């Protein structure tokens, strides 16, 4: 008693961004690069258009 007081109000917000973020899945690939600079020799043929 005997005192007033003055009141300012505030607010905060608590939010998860990251839980949604993840890495889904990772994949890779196997390739045969045609550079020239080769002989055939092993095997033959095989895949034929």
């Amino acid at each position: 008693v005997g005192f007033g007081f003055i009141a300012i109000t505030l607010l905060t917000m608590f939010i998860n961004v990251g839980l949604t973020l993840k890495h889904t899945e990772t994949i890779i690939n196997k390739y045969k690069n045609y550079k020239w600079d080769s002989g055939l020799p092993t095997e033959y043929a095989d895949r034929i258009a």
Binding site: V1, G2, F3, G4
Partner: protein, 658 residues
Amino acid sequence: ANTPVNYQLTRTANAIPEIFVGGTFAEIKQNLIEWLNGQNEFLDYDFEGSRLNVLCDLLAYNTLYIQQFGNAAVYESFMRTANLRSSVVQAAQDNGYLPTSKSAAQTEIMLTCTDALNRNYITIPRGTRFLAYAKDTSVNPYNFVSREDVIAIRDKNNQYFPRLKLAQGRIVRTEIIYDKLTPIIIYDKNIDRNQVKLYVDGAEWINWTRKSMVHAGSTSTIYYMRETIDGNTEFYFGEGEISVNASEGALTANYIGGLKPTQNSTIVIEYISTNGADANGAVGFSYADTLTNITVININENPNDDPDFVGADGGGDPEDIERIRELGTIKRETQQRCVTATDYDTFVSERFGSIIQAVQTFTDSTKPGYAFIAAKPKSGLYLTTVQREDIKNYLKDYNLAPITPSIISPNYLFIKTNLKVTYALNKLQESEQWLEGQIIDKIDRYYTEDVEIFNSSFAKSKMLTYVDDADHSVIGSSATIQMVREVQNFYKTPEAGIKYNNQIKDRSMESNTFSFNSGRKVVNPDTGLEEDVLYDVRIVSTDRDSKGIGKVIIGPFASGDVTENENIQPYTGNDFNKLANSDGRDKYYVIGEINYPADVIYWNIAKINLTSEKFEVQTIELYSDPTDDVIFTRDGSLIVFENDLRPQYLTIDLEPIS
């Protein structure tokens, strides 16, 4: 709208564990009669067969006989469920708050007395008794005694007034040898624990507890009270480590509880039993005990006049279970030292609880450092300035240091009423006049029953119910209210103005007539000089104006009284109400203005430039008629019933009928 709910609040207003609740016997049996049934031992036996029935019927009788024992104890067991009052105090006493016995009618006097001896200093020793007739009755005075020693400087001219304050009763002192095993009873009724002071051998000890309690006295000096269930008070003090504990400030330490006694510390106590609550308003005093060489030449009532005051004070019932019951919880809540506003409410309620029916603790946000208090002298509306000062300082004991207590009686709405009440002559053999003396009690009854409690909306009619209820030989009852406030300055409205909180009829805003000194001269044969002329005026509201406003019309003015200014003109409107004067003076000015919807009312006499002092009286009473049935209160503005001090506010017409 109103209150939607999700499963809200809790368990009604207050706990009733309600397994305890006493039920109706038949149901009790009805419950129990089932109980014996289903009992594995017999599923056969028919209870409605009257033979077993009355047999089981009996079990419930005891079971009910025994239950109210078990149940009531619980009500008892739990404060605020406690039905016994001497219960209530116990837990309250336990909570660190006690209700007190009727508290002596108290007052102050200054008295001018010549010492026959002409010594520099006489004392008035504590214990000189004075007599006061109760108000209007001289058949017996009420004795009352000097509270304490006081001395007075002899003034020159040899006459000098001491002053001293006075509580009612007789000093009654009793020495007792203290002993280890024994109660210490005072069987005295009319005792009050507040005027109880004592002496161990020599020095005074204080029950810590609302006498001083903060001083260097180290707490070794102390004692307690308690209420014997009988109604008489027994003494108590702490035994062994009477101070907090152990070594504390002494280097030798060891143990001291005091009061061995063997015979040590023969306890002599001194107190006043009192007739109080009957003695309030005792004006005429006597100097009822002589002393050596002192002679009172005059005892003059009430130094530092209120000016509105009555004789003595105090007394008290003592007891009320309702005001007491919840209350100590706050003191159970608060510590000794008072901190919270309502803590200042309840704390004040302790001492001068019999002085104060209701006390309003609040801050005024304007002035910090001040504890603003609105209380009910409960004998009247105005605590005499010494009381105010009194409890203040005493209150001020418990308080935050920079804080100051500030006590003011708030403004008071006054209900000004003429009453029209009919009765059948024949129907009553009883003296007609005394009937009025009857109702005039039952009027405040409603107030005390209601209005001062919450200071909520006020119901005229509902008031008129109980006065209707009075004789039942009263045939009918009628009344009409005029809402009335009092004004401190006629001259300038309080800054904020004044508001009714309550809708009034337009043009129904009135005030009191009062003279005004006018510079113009009067002389009459044999009268001679005769100062000048003075006539009377009053405060008048004009009609409602659009936007619910009105301008305050001054009372009528004679010509040449008010210097006419190009700005200020005689209002000279058609509407505004006018008193009828022999002057026929038609000069009326707007001194200020109002609006009816806001109920806020302002004027300034600086407006009309008329001098404050050419008015005789500083305060004027305010008249108004609220258009609404019931009176609404908000803050510090409370309707209340004081007829005795202000009868003109309360009038009753009596209609005899055959």
